[PDB]
Write an enzyme that holds these catalytic residues in place. Structure first.
Site, PDB file in Angstrom:
ATOM      1  N   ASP A  37      35.664 109.973  26.254  1.00  0.00           N
ATOM      2  CA  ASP A  37      36.488 109.204  27.238  1.00  0.00           C
ATOM      3  C   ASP A  37      35.694 109.059  28.541  1.00  0.00           C
ATOM      4  O   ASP A  37      35.704 109.961  29.420  1.00  0.00           O
ATOM      5  CB  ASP A  37      37.826 110.009  27.501  1.00  0.00           C
ATOM      6  CG  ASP A  37      38.784 109.254  28.399  1.00  0.00           C
ATOM      7  OD1 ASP A  37      38.528 108.066  28.760  1.00  0.00           O
ATOM      8  OD2 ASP A  37      39.807 109.834  28.785  1.00  0.00           O
ATOM      9  N   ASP A 222      35.598 102.009  30.270  1.00  0.00           N
ATOM     10  CA  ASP A 222      36.494 103.142  29.823  1.00  0.00           C
ATOM     11  C   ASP A 222      36.602 103.187  28.291  1.00  0.00           C
ATOM     12  O   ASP A 222      37.371 102.422  27.653  1.00  0.00           O
ATOM     13  CB  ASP A 222      37.880 102.972  30.445  1.00  0.00           C
ATOM     14  CG  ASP A 222      38.810 104.111  30.054  1.00  0.00           C
ATOM     15  OD1 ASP A 222      38.341 105.057  29.373  1.00  0.00           O
ATOM     16  OD2 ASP A 222      40.015 103.983  30.349  1.00  0.00           O
TER      17      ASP A 222
END
Ligand SMILES: N#Cc1ccc(C(=O)Nc2ccc(F)c([C@]3(CF)C[C@@H](C(F)(F)F)OC(N)=N3)c2)nc1
Ligand code: NA
Ligand code: NA
EC number: 3.4.23.46
Length: 379
Positions: A37, A222
């Site tokens: 992440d 992201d």
């Protein structure tokens, strides 16, 4: 430098559930699968028998666990987790041959956070300390890795969409994972991996918005979000433009809002009616930009778990945002993305594994001349 065969293909996933890497925590090592992440900065792992979890960190079994005597409560827009902070020894078995003492949040309570059916049981936040919880004194994993070893301060991600897979090359780049050249955009500020988009086109047609709208209030890269998310006003213009370009088929309005799926007879998806999407990013040189282009194969996501249907169903995965642009997996699956933290810049090149067809491919092209690009940032 440039060749890291032990790390190629070290990511796995399933459509809809993101990309994870194997890690070990503790002594003796406990193996856990951990979502990659770049949109957060905590290393947080399930540490209790939640029913969705295949495996969880059992601190009691680790001789090297050290408790920080400090809790953390972390809500997101949807989902929350609560945990107890400590440190332990961490390795990445298909990664560099090193072991580091890292912070870990042992998640003891969660809501809408784990996915029922996924194969990962924690998250590896790869962004910077500024957005760590509870505050910037909790050093993120990658910072610890770089302080404590000789691993270079950079990593690169190749996300290969639909089982999904890909590579996270830790401490370098592997030139077999991309074609053509890498083009770099500056990291505007070290908190998220924030970048600046300077122009947007749909099938080569500029949306012609004030470019600050593209970055209101930020734009980030992201890997822990699926969609390309766009500020509302930009979303509105982009959809209006995409509907126009594909207008030889009519779709229900709810489709464009991600409120319903669209389905075609198998093997017949009309890819060619849908336009390509280009983002121009601020380049390394004054008045210089480059552009990245993705296909409908990235932004129309297959939904296979549609138990009420026989056909090929897709979700529209460009959606409106009130937190800025999010270049999630819809963008990253077109590209090999280099998080060059040492030089505060992000590289993109065409991914050698990206999904495309005989007529069109994802593309990274430059240089272009773009003026006033510093005005595109929002303060
Ligand atoms: N492709 C793909 C794909 C599919 C699923 C997923 C997936 O489930 N991610 C996931 C799940 C729970 C999470 F709480 C987060 C968080 C953790 F910080 C918060 C989330 C937010 F801030 F948005 F809430 O944005 C980011 N960046 N990280 C991410 N990730 C990628
Ligand atoms: Na170092
Ligand atoms: Na190459």
């Amino acid at each position: 430098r440039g060749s890291f065969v032990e790390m190629v293909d070290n990511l796995r996933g399933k459509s809809g559930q993101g990309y994870y890497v194997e890690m070990t925590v503790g002594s003796p090592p406990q193996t856990l699968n951990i979502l990659v992440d770049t949109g957060s900065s905590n290393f947080a792992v399930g540490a209790a028998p939640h029913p969705f979890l295949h495996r969880y960190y059992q601190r009691q079994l680790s001789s090297t666990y050290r408790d920080l005597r400090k809790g953390v409560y972390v809500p997101y827009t949807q989902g929350k987790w609560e945990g107890e902070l400590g440190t332990d020894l961490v390795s990445i078995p298909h990664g560099p041959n090193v072991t580091v003492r890292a912070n870990i949040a042992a998640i003891t309570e969660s809501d809408k956070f784990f996915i029922n059916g996924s194969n990962w049981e924690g998250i590896l936040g790869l962004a910077y300390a500024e957005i760590a919880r509870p505050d910037d004194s909790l050093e993120p994993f990658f910072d610890s890795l770089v302080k404590q070893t000789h691993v270079p301060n950079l990593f690169s991600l190749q996300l290969c969409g639909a089982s999904v897979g890909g590579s996270m090359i830790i401490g370098g780049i592997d030139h077999s994972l991309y074609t053509g050249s890498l083009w770099y955009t500056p990291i505007r500020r070290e908190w998220y991996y924030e970048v600046i988009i300077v122009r947007v086109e749909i099938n080569g047609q500029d949306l012609k918005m004030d470019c600050k709208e593209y970055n209101y209030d930020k734009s980030i890269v992201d890997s822990g979000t699926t969609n390309l998310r766009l500020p509302k006003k930009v979303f509105e213009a982009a959809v209006a433009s995409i509907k126009a370009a594909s207008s030889t088929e009519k779709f229900p309005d709810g489709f464009w809002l991600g409120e319903q799926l669209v389905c075609w007879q198998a093997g017949t998806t009309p890819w060619n009616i849908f336009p390509v999407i280009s983002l121009y990013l601020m380049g390394e040189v004054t008045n210089q930009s480059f552009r990245i282009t993705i296909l409908p194969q990235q932004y129309l996501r297959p939904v296979e778990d549609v138990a009420t249907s026989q056909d090929d169903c897709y979700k529209f995965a460009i959606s409106q945002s009130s937190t800025g642009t999010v270049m999630g997996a819809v963008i990253m699956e077109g590209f090999y993305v280099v998080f060059d933290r040492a030089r505060k810049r992000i590289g993109f090149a065409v991914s050698a594994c990206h999904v495309h067809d005989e007529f069109r491919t994802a593309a990274v092209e430059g240089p272009f001349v773009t003026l006033d690009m510093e005005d595109c940032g929002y303060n």
